[PDB]
Symmetry: C5
Subunit: 279 residues, 5 copies
């Protein structure tokens, strides 16, 4: 997979724009329950063993594969052009919507007060790759009984192993590995990016725990992420496909009853790519 | 529009100064004006639906600045800006007559909690994307703030809790675009620069800086700043600085004004 | 004033040292009657009925000094090029055993000085330009005592003074006289001054401060010019509120610390 | 004496590994107790003197020695080639797992609410060296009776001194030194890196105390730590051994009863080494 | 006058030391009270005036003078850089001190947290100190701690709540100068470098870093480090890391030792 020179010429640079809507558990706006689109259901400890969480309570990674302009007339040549992602402008959309402290069923911060704003657990990541993101499985509790389904979601450790989790899945088990190849099917609480692979991807992420911790976010269209590695090489899109992945949990909606649901926001991407000779 | 060379000469540079007063809900000091720079009391009803009043919807400030007329032609290019939140010091006041106390015999709870800060400099209106916390929120009809129902010509659906590419607007009117409804559209705004932050929480400290030594460069990666179409410079902002906590337990958001000093140069364009 | 070249010669550079003591409300230590509360306010409380009629002891104000510089005289002016500045006495805030300190819980230590912080300093060749803006326009500040928006306008504040009112302007020409809660630096003026500040609200928010004698602030603008001292006077201004003293009864007073300055100045030709 | 970097073909090599946390329950393989793998047991003040902590409540450092390819045919020569560690990409794995706020026995934040997220005390460090990490002993309370090493306990200050601790071990006792040469046997609360030694190691660490303090962690495969010193020399691997140490405490699991247990996450390393001539 | 840096074979030396914290119980070698070494006694507002704090409740600065090899227009050692580290940070993960107050019933102990104070100084003479106290009516013990009364020879007046030019001392004795009374004097200390911070609050997270890759450069703006008068290097510090919370509700401040490795070079001076 030898990288040669950057292609020179007129249309050697292109731009790819897209947005990814969050997949928090209620993943569709088009259902007769869709009122909770971009939210989970109510998150509660069961109180007895074992936990059997519902799919609505399992926020999942967003992913899209973007098809790119075909570059090579004869694909049997050793030396071909490939799209190389060199930079990205990315932004969490709808941040301002979180100033709303008057949702009708918001728990009031104290008697007669404004609602507790969306706050608490945050998880924020994005990835740009020339192939699916590689995932490592690890869970808080190996005894958790994740939903078994027939329609390909959610995919968890039991799904990939073809057998029950054992205690080692609370740590790093090299067999618990997957590719982020489907939108809204790989739960955040089960899968993280695999740092031992992903040579052809760049990812950036953070978590914030706490129950009412401030959600603190910036947005600016002046911010650019360079996607080049130390050798000056960005992700190379094999099969003329650009993989874009993300997750943006922005906190809890505090309901009057005391119930709490996690909330997510969409993410925008503008990826600059260039043509690169490879061998 | 292809960008040519920067113009050289004696009157090549100019500086535009302005301030923008906050539009929190009570938007005029010349009327109920006692609550100017504040909302009314923000309070989840406990029952459905939510029908917020106009006084409870903080909105973006905006001004179009007419620039000296110039005229393949010359356009004004915004190259840098000094901007500052004005009146930050007023927030040390912990003795508002009706301020809720931190405890018995204590000082008032200081303005703190939800902050939202943004400013934009552009050569056309700021492009907005609509997204709401709850699509069932019934905003007042435009007679009146502009919201998603106004632009769509029909009610919101669940998709307006996410990114609906139809929910788009332009920031063309001062005090009319609710902050909780509209955010800068990153898919557009090629000819504007915007910078913003949010801080959620109820008594989360308000932490702000001020200095006249701080400059924001508005040039893009190619060395080109926003280009002022029809000789109009668009200046937009929002500066929510937290809640005024009242004795009863009621709470209102508060805003502060923003000052701008924009440096512009003449630029040949085709 | 057109700025020419930096003067060359043996004694073209001078250094100015000073400290400013905080003006928190009880502004003097020399009153045998009430100076125990020097560097603090009195007890800050919401009145519970309208209007607020705050006392002078509850209005922290800016510190100011004009420093006389050597007479030089198209003429020469002193140009401030850098400053080393420090909040003095930061270590005193480890004391959690003030005799009347509200305890964190039963048998525990005192609540340390914490909560509202406001820190700013300014160096200029003339008084700092101030913009007026208050939380509540119906506040009835003491008559001139402190100089407030009502003082400069010669009439009662109106709602517009809760936002930016271009008539609500003053110069910081008097020590301990301009209430911090009324006045902020005017960013529309102050071309011949450099100012830096911040605020932190919240009731018990940690007071977090640094101090080092290795930190210099460069005062030159984007054109390599520092403030130029009109009539050979250097103006230094600051405020350093460091949080609340929490008292047993529930009462709370604001506290401030002093600030030190070492300003480096050079001679500059101007026209 | 350090001489010149070796110029040649296979002059650079990469070493990949992960270390699973040793929080107290250190094996996933034990017949009965292993469900608490990556956790401590319940942490409690005894209420009477002295503290007599159990193994399971004493998080320890992770460590591995990695065998490097043999470089010298003749080991008698004055001048030899050694592996020199020059950079490392390291990442805490499984960070996303901490969004789980529905552990079956999770203490709620309030009635009907979600579980208190894993939060509070954090401790994070990693070290890359050419020899075992040098340790310095210091404890909160010198009267603490750690389980005896001979009884199958961890190695602590008493172990190294051959006698009981005295009040001076609440400060810096220059005789309370050890080397990190054993996985999950040196307690974090007893041993910190020794700054008076470790010339042939690079270490980086932080603590965060408080009970429900947000756990704030980042992850990216774009972040590289440079291991070179001020003279441009990285750790030199004695006996062809690369020493890799870490500790990643990420907070408390809050249980319904009020009981609390600390939790850790695994850490991944990718160390780049080059060949170096040494006299 | 500072001349040229000495060139030659043995011109650079390294000085290594550590300093144990002087929180109040200053010695590990006492009959029955050393169990609290590196801590204060219990800190408690009396509820009546005046405060009469005990020496066990007054954390003080650590200081050492290191003798450097003799050299003698003369040569002097010049401190050019330091690696410094707070040792024992990992010990603070212990949430099971036998008498630790719980966060809630059945819970773990409240971790060491709250007030932090961190400072270090390297110089060629003793650090210059400025006196300032929260409460000038505080009755400190006589000499033993050295406080403002000791140095003035008369009672503190209200001015000592601010900056009193007469309230000055030199940090010449280990564990004798209370932190709550003395801070580094910025009006002197030309021949020292000092770096410090405070963090207030009762349960504020203790957030500390440690790494053997961090170096502080000690040279001033002219490239000159502290010059060691009479071949003596002065090293001073303080590291309060927060409170130990006891079951009863009582609280003690706690400190940690600090390590130093100073690089010095020979410098010609007239
Ligand atoms: C059956 C009965 O009533 N017995 C009591 C016995 O409990 C008591 O001992 C004291 O009990 C209290 C209970 O809150 C504390 O546990 C005392 O311990 C501490 C404290 O936390 O207050 C421990 C702390 O470390 C000590 N501080 C220092 C600096 O050493 C303090 C301190 O010495 C005391 O508060 C005195 O200032 O004590 C514990 O001593 C005894 C003795 O009072 O009386 C029996 O009748
Ligand atoms: C500014 C000041 O001196 N405040 C003091 C007040 C007032 O003397 C009286 O309340 C009269 O208003 O009295 C206290 O006992 C109190 O209530 O806590 C102590 C406090 O320091
Ligand atoms: Cl995050
Ligand atoms: Cl913000
Ligand atoms: Cl501040
Ligand atoms: Cl940490
Ligand atoms: Cl600190």
């Amino acid at each position: 997979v030898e990288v040669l020179s950057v292609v020179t010429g007129e249309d050697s640079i292109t731009q790819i724009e897209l947005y990814l809507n969050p997949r928090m558990g209620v993943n569709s706006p088009d259902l007769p329950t869709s009122n909770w689109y971009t939210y989970t259901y109510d998150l509660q400890p069961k109180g007895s063993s074992p936990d059997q969480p519902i799919k609505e309570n399992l926020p999942a990674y967003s992913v899209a594969r973007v098809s790119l302009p075909m570059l090579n007339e004869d694909i049997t040549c050793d030396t071909l052009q490939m799209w190389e992602a060199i930079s990205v402008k990315t932004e969490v959309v709808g941040i301002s919507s979180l100033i709303n402290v008057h949702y009708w069923d918001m728990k009031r911060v104290h008697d007669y007060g404004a609602g507790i704003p969306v706050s608490g657990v945050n998880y924020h990541m994005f990835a740009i790759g020339g192939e699916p993101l590689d995932l490592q499985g690890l869970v808080l509790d190996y005894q958790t009984q994740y939903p078994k389904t027939t329609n390909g979601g959610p995919i968890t450790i039991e799904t990939v192993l073809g057998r029950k989790m054992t205690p080692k899945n609370q740590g790093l088990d090299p067999q618990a590995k997957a590719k982020l190849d489907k939108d809204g099917n790989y739960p955040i609480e089960v899968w993280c990016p695999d740092p031992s692979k992903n040579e052809n991807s760049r990812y950036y992420g953070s978590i914030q725990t706490g129950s009412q911790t401030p959600t603190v976010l910036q947005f600016s269209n002046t911010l650019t992420t360079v996607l080049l590695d130390e050798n000056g090489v960005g992700p190379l899109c094999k099969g003329d496909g650009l993989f874009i992945s993300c997750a943006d949990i922005v906190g809890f909606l505090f309901k009057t009853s005391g119930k709490m649901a996690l909330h997510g926001l969409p993410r925008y991407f503008n990826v600059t790519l260039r043509k690169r000779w490879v061998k």
